[PDB]
Amino acid sequence: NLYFQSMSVGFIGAGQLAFALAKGFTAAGVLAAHKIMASSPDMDLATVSALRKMGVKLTPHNKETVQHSDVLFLAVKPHIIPFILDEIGADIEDRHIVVSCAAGVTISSIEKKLSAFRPAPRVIRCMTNTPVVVREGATVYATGTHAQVEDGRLMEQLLSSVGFCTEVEEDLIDAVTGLSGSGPAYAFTALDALADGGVKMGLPRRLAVRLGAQALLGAAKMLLHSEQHPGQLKDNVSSPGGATIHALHVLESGGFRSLLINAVEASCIRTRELQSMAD
Amino acid sequence: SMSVGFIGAGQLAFALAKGFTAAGVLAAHKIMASSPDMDLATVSALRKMGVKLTPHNKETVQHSDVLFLAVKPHIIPFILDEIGADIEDRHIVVSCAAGVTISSIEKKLSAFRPAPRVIRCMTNTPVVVREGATVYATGTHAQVEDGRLMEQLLSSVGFCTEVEEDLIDAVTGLSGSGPAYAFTALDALADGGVKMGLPRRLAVRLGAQALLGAAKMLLHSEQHPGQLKDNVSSPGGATIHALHVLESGGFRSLLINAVEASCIRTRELQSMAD
Amino acid sequence: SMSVGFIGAGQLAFALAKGFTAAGVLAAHKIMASSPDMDLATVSALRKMGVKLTPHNKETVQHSDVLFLAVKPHIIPFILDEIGADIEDRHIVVSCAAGVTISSIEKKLSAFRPAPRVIRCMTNTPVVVREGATVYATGTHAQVEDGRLMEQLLSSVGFCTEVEEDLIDAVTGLSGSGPAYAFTALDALADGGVKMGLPRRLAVRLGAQALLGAAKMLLHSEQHPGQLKDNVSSPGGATIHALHVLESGGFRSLLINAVEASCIRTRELQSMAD
Amino acid sequence: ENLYFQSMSVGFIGAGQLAFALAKGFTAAGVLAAHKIMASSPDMDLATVSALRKMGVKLTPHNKETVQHSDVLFLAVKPHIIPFILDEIGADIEDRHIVVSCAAGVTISSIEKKLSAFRPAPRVIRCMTNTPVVVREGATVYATGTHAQVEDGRLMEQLLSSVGFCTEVEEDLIDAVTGLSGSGPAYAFTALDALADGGVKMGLPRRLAVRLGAQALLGAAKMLLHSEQHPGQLKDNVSSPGGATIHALHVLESGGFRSLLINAVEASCIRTRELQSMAD
Amino acid sequence: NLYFQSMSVGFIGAGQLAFALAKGFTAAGVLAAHKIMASSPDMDLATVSALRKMGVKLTPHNKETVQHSDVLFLAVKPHIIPFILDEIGADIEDRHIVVSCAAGVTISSIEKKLSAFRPAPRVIRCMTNTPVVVREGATVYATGTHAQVEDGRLMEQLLSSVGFCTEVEEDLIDAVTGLSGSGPAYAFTALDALADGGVKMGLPRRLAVRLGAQALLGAAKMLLHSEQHPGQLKDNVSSPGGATIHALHVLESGGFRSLLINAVEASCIRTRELQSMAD
C-alpha cells in the first residue's frame, strides 16, 4: 500500500534504464506515470516512444526535468554525467535529491561539480539493473555527504518497490556493478547457450528457451528462499552416477566456475578503470 | 560538374575511382590520381578506365575540388607539407588514411592558409563493387554542404553515415579490416567444402554466396542475428551440430579479438605519429 | 503458366515463396502451401503475400505442377505415403529436405505410379532476399527440361547449379548451414565493435555491410581469396595485426570443423533414416 | 666475371659461420680467389677457422691486418662486439674502403657515428643475408649509408647476387628481413627434421624421409618463385576434394600452424630490435 | 643428352598432374610435345588449354591416347581409375607400360582389372608431386609383377629428368604420399604464413613472399648438399641469445614439430583409408 503522493520524479536520459525504472515504478503503483518526466536530446528513440505510451512526460530540455522534479535520476552514460552537471547545476535546489545511476561515477565527483553552484547537494549513488522492469531488480545505494537520513530511507523505499535494495558503502559499488549490474547479460548469454544445447538434443527452440529460463528462475528462487549453501542444493539434484553429475563434470572440465569469476572481475576492473580515466 | 583528385594511386584510390565511375556519379575524366611510381599495377588500371594520371601531386591539387588522401598514414605529413601552399578556399581535403586525425591534418594545412576544409573518412575495398562501408567526420571548417556532398558521393559506392571522429578507429577495426576477416573465412570455408568432397571452384562460389546472402538478410531484417541463426537450425540437425563446434573453439571471441586488435593498432599507430 | 506447391509452410517455404514472388517469376496466387498448423507465424505471412493455404497436403498436390517438399527430413516418408497415390505424370517432385536421398523418394513414390519425376535440392534461407545458394540433382525419371525448369526457377532467387547427388551433403555443410555461421560471426563482430565503443546498431550495420561487400568482391574477382586479403593489409598495419589474432585462435580450422560437422551430421541422419 | 677481373680483396672481421658461408659461396661462384679473402678472429681454434684455412682463406688474429688487406670489409662479428671492433680499427678505415656490416640489428647510424670520428665520409653498407649463400641460394638485402657512392651499392648487389637473391631496401625493413629470411633457414631445418620424423613414423627409412622432405620443400619454393600465382592457389592445385592433402592441411590448421610461423618472424624481428635498443 | 626418340607418352586425364609432368618432360628436352597425347572428357579446362599451347595432342577419347601411346600415365582421380581400366583394358597391348600416378591405388588392383583382358600387363605405380613442373619433383616408383627390369630403368630415366626419383617397395608409397606428395601444400601454407609474418613486421607483401620462398629453397638445398643433420645446420644459424633462437623457442612452444608429424600421418592414413574403401 505504498504511494509517494508528494514526490515528482525526473530522469535525465530517456534510454534503457530510465524506461526500466519508470515501467517498474508505475507497475508497482508507487508512482503515476504523469508524475514522471524524462529528458533526452533524441526524441526518435524507441525507449522515448515507449515512455510516451506509458504516460510519462517527455521534454528535450534537461532544465525542465530539473524544475519538474524532486527526485532526479541521472540515467545517462558515465562520460555524459559531468556535462549534465555543468548544464543543470545552477538549477539544483534545496529540495532535490540527485540519484546517479551511472556506472563508476563517484559521489565525490558529482558533489564537487554541484557544490560549485550551491553548497550541500543531496546526492545518492546507486547501481541497479534492467530487471527492475519486471520488478525483480537488484539495487544497492550509497548516501552522499549531505544526504539526510530520510533521503536514503526514501530511496530504499522507492527502489525496493522494483526489486531487492540495500544500502552499501560506496566502495562496494564497482564490485556490485560487475556482479548484479552486468549479471543479467551473463544470464542472457547462458540462456541462449542452454537453448542451443536443447535444440542440439532435439528440442524446438521456443520450448528450449522457455525451459532454460524457467530452470534458472526456479533455481535462483530456491537459493534465495533457502538457508543452504548452493553446493548443497546442487548435491540434491545429482543422483549417483546420474545425468546431472555427468553434466557437472563437463562444466568443471571447461573451468566454467573460473569464467564467471573472470567476468565479475573484468566488469569491476573496467568500471574502476573508466572512472580513473574520468578523474 | 565536380572535379575529384587522388593523392596516391594504390588499392584504395583504384577501388574508389572504379566505384564512383561505375555508379555514374563521376566521369572518369573528372578524376586525376598521382603517384611517384607510374609503373604500378593500379596506375595502369586507372589509365584504362579513363582517369588522368600524373607523377606530380601539385597537378592533382590544381585540378581537384574534392581531394582524397589515399597514401599510407606515415606519408600524410609529407604530402601535407608538399601541397599545403597549394590548397585553396574551394578545396575539400578528404583524408582516407587509417588513424590520422583531423587535428593533425588541420594543424599542418593551417600553417599555409587558415580554415582548411577537412573531412576524415574510413572506407573499405568493397567500394570497388559499390558495396563499401564508409563513415566520415567533418572538420572544424567544413561547411554543412561539405558533409552533405561527402555523404552523397560515398553513398553511391556503399553504406555511408557521418560519425563523431572518436568512433573512427573502432570502425577501422570492424568494417575497415572486416573484408580481410571475410576473405580469411571464405578461404577456410572453401577448404572445408573441399575436405568434404566439393571441387574448389564450387566451394568458393557457394561459400561466398552464402555469406553474401546472409549479410543481405541481416541488413534487410529488423530481427536480431541470433534470431536469424535460430531460423536456420532445425532441432538435432546439421547446422546446430556445426554451430557447437564453432562455439567450442571460441569462434565469437576470435572475431571480438580481431576488431579489438585492429582498433588498438590503429590507436597505437596514431600515437606514434603524434 | 506454372503452378507451384509447398508441402510444409515453415521457414524454407516462406523464404522460397517470398523470393519467387519478389523475383516476378511466379505470382503469389500460383503458389499453394499446406501445413497441419494453420496458426503458424510463417503461414500468416504467406497468407498476406497472396499464397493459397490449406491444411490438406492432397489439395496442394492437386493444384501443383512443381511440388516442393519443405518438411523436416524425418517427415518426408510420412508425406510420401500420404500423397503417393496422388502423384501424376505431370508432377515434378522437388525435395528440399536435408540428407533425404533421391533413391528413398523414388522407392516410396514408385509403389504408387512408376517413373516419378524427382529432383533433390539444397538451398538456404537467403533465397528470401534473392541471394540464395542452391544446388540440385535430377532423378532417374526427370526429363532434361525438368532440370532446366528447375534451374530457371531457382536461379531467380540466387545462384543455382546442377550437381551430382553425392555432393549435396557437403553442400549442406557449406552453403546450407553457412548463413548460420555468418549470423554467428556478425553477432560477434558487432560485439567487438561495441567493445571498442560503437553503438550496437551501427556495429551490426557496418559488420554486415563489410561481409556483404567482401563476398561480392570475391564473387566478382578471379583472384584468390588470399590475394584479396593481401590487398587489404598494409605492412605493419591494423588489419595484419587482427589477422594474426584470428590465426592464433585457429579461426580457419574452426570453419573447416563446422563444414565437416554439418556434412557428417547430414550423412549420419540419412543413415538413420535408411 | 667482371668482378673476378676486378681482383677485389675482401676481408672478414669475425671468422665464424657467416664468414665461412660467404667465403665458400664467393669462391664457389668464382667471383673471388680464396686467397684474396682474409679473416680475423681472436679464437683461432674454431671449426669455422679450420674450414676457412682449408679453403685457402688467409687467417690472422689481428683485425688491423684484415682491414689493411681489404677493399670490401665485412663485419661478421656478434652485434654487441661491433662497437668494440669499430673503436679498435676505426683509425684504420681508409677512404677506399667499403664497410659492409652483416650484424643483426646494428644500424648504419651507429656505425657511421663511430667511424666518422676518424675519417669524415666512411662508406657504409648494411646487409642481412643467410647461411644458404654457402650453396649460392642466399637471400640478401642491403641498405646504403650516407656516404656510399651509387657505384658502391651496385658493386655490393653484383657481389651478393653471385651467391643468391639480392636487392636494395630501405634500412628500416632490415630487422623484419632478419626475422623472415635471416632466421628463416632455421625454421626450415626444424620443419625438415619434423617432416622426416613424420615420414619415419609412417614407415619410411630416415635417409629417404629426409631426402623426400627436403626435395618437396625445394621444389615447392622454386614453384612459387617461378609462378605469378598466389601460394593459396598453388596449395589448391595439390589437394583433390576429399583427398589426403586436404586432410593433412586441416590438422595443420587445427594446431595454428600459420600463427606459429607469424609468431616466429615477429619474435626474431622484435629480439633484433630489442638488442639494438640495448646497444643504443 | 637424354632423349627417348622411340617413345610415345600418353596421359589419361589432362589436369594438374598431366600438365606438370608434360611441362617438365618437354622443358627437360627428353620429349617433344607433339609426341605427347592427353585425354579428358572436359576440353574447356585451363590445363587442357595450357597443354594445347605447349603442342601436346589432345583428344576426348581415352582409346585414342592408348592407341597413340607406349608409356601410358594414369592421371585421373583415384576413384576414376577402375572406370578407366574397364574402358581401355581391351586396348592394352604387349608394348604398353601403364604408369599409375593415382594416390593410394595399388598395383594389385590395377593388374587384376587389366589381367581380365590380356595376361601380364606391365604396371608401374608412382607417387610424384607438382614441382616436376619446374623439374624439381620428388618421385618414387614401384614395379609390378610383369614389369620387365628395363621398364623400371626406363621410367627412372624419364622421371629423373624432372626431379629426384628412386625405386621403392610398394608398401612405402602411401607414406611417401603423406610426405612429398602432399608436401608442397604444407610448404605453400608455410610460405603464405611466413609472408604474413613479414608483412606484420613492416615488409611489402611481394618482398616478403620472395624472401620467404628464397629462404626455404636455400635451406632445403643446403640440407640436400650437406652430410650434416638438420639440427646441426639449425645450430649454425642461431647465435647465443640471438634473434633466431628466440624465434625457435616460440615455434617449439606451439608444438610446431608435432604439427608437421601430424600432417604426414594424416595424409598417409587418409591415403590408406581411401584405398581400403576402394577394395
Ligand SMILES: NC(=O)C1=CN([C@@H]2O[C@H](COP(=O)(O)OP(=O)(O)OC[C@H]3O[C@@H](n4cnc5c(N)ncnc54)[C@H](O)[C@@H]3O)[C@@H](O)[C@H]2O)C=CC1
Ligand atoms: N542498461 C543497464 O543495464 C544499466 C545501465 N546503468 C547506467 O545507466 C546509465 C544509462 O544506461 P542506458 O540507459 O543503458 O543508456 P542508454 O544509452 O540506453 O540511454 C542513454 C540516454 O541518455 C541520453 N542522453 C545523451 N546525452 C544526453 C544529455 N546531454 N542530456 C540528457 N540525456 C542525454 C540518450 O539520448 C539516451 O536516451 C549509464 O550510466 C549506465 O551505466 C546502470 C545499471 C544498469
Ligand SMILES: NC(=O)C1=CN([C@@H]2O[C@H](COP(=O)(O)OP(=O)(O)OC[C@H]3O[C@@H](n4cnc5c(N)ncnc54)[C@H](O)[C@@H]3O)[C@@H](O)[C@H]2O)C=CC1
Ligand atoms: N586498402 C584498404 O583496404 C584501405 C586502405 N585505407 C587507407 O588508404 C591509404 C592507402 O591504402 P592502399 O591504397 O591500400 O595503399 P597502397 O600502398 O595500395 O597505395 C598507396 C599509394 O601511395 C603512393 N605514394 C607513396 N608515396 C607517395 C607520395 N609521396 N605522393 C603520392 N603518392 C604516394 C604509393 O606509390 C601507392 O600508389 C592508407 O592510409 C590506408 O590506411 C583505408 C581503408 C581501406
Ligand SMILES: NC(=O)C1=CN([C@@H]2O[C@H](COP(=O)(O)OP(=O)(O)OC[C@H]3O[C@@H](n4cnc5c(N)ncnc54)[C@H](O)[C@@H]3O)[C@@H](O)[C@H]2O)C=CC1
Ligand atoms: N530453414 C533452412 O535454413 C533450410 C531448411 N532446409 C530443409 O527444409 C525443410 C524444412 O526446413 P524449415 O522450413 O526450416 O522447417 P520448419 O520447421 O520451419 O517448417 C516445417 C513445416 O513442416 C510442417 N509440417 C509438419 N508435419 C507436416 C505434415 N505432416 N504435412 C505437412 N506439413 C507438415 C510444420 O508444421 C512446419 O510448418 C527441412 O527438411 C530442412 O532440411 C533446407 C535448406 C535450408
Ligand SMILES: NC(=O)C1=CN([C@@H]2O[C@H](COP(=O)(O)OP(=O)(O)OC[C@H]3O[C@@H](n4cnc5c(N)ncnc54)[C@H](O)[C@@H]3O)[C@@H](O)[C@H]2O)C=CC1
Ligand atoms: N649465422 C647466420 O645465420 C647469420 C649471421 N648473421 C650475423 O653475422 C654475425 C656473425 O654471425 P656468426 O658468424 O653466426 O657468429 P659466429 O659466432 O659463428 O662467428 C663470430 C666470430 O666473431 C669472432 N670474434 C669475436 N670477437 C672478435 C673480435 N674482437 N675481433 C674479431 N673477430 C672476433 C669469433 O671468434 C667468431 O669467429 C652476427 O652479427 C650475426 O647477426 C647474419 C646473417 C645470418
Ligand SMILES: NC(=O)C1=CN([C@@H]2O[C@H](COP(=O)(O)OP(=O)(O)OC[C@H]3O[C@@H](n4cnc5c(N)ncnc54)[C@H](O)[C@@H]3O)[C@@H](O)[C@H]2O)C=CC1
Ligand atoms: N595434383 C597433385 O599434386 C598430384 C596428384 N597426384 C594424382 O594424380 C591424379 C590426378 O591428380 P590432378 O591431376 O591433381 O587431378 P585434376 O582433377 O587436376 O585432373 C584430373 C583429370 O581427370 C580428368 N578425367 C575425369 N574423368 C576422366 C575419364 N573418365 N577419362 C579421362 N580423364 C578423366 C578430368 O577431366 C581432369 O582433366 C590423382 O589420382 C592424384 O592422386 C599425384 C601426385 C601429385
Ligand SMILES: O=C(O)[C@H]1CCCS1
Ligand atoms: O540423477 C539425476 O541427475 C537426474 C535427476 C536430475 C535430472 S537427471
Ligand SMILES: O=C(O)[C@H]1CCCS1
Ligand atoms: O540444420 C538444419 O536443420 C538444416 C538447415 C539447412 C542446412 S542443414
Ligand SMILES: O=C(O)[C@H]1CCCS1
Ligand atoms: O590494415 C590497414 O593497412 C588498413 C586498411 C584498412 C583498414 S586498416
Ligand SMILES: O=C(O)[C@H]1CCCS1
Ligand atoms: O589429392 C591429394 O591430396 C593427393 C595429391 C597428391 C598427394 S595426395
Ligand SMILES: O=C(O)[C@H]1CCCS1
Ligand atoms: O644470431 C642470430 O640469430 C642472427 C643470425 C641469423 C639471423 S639473426
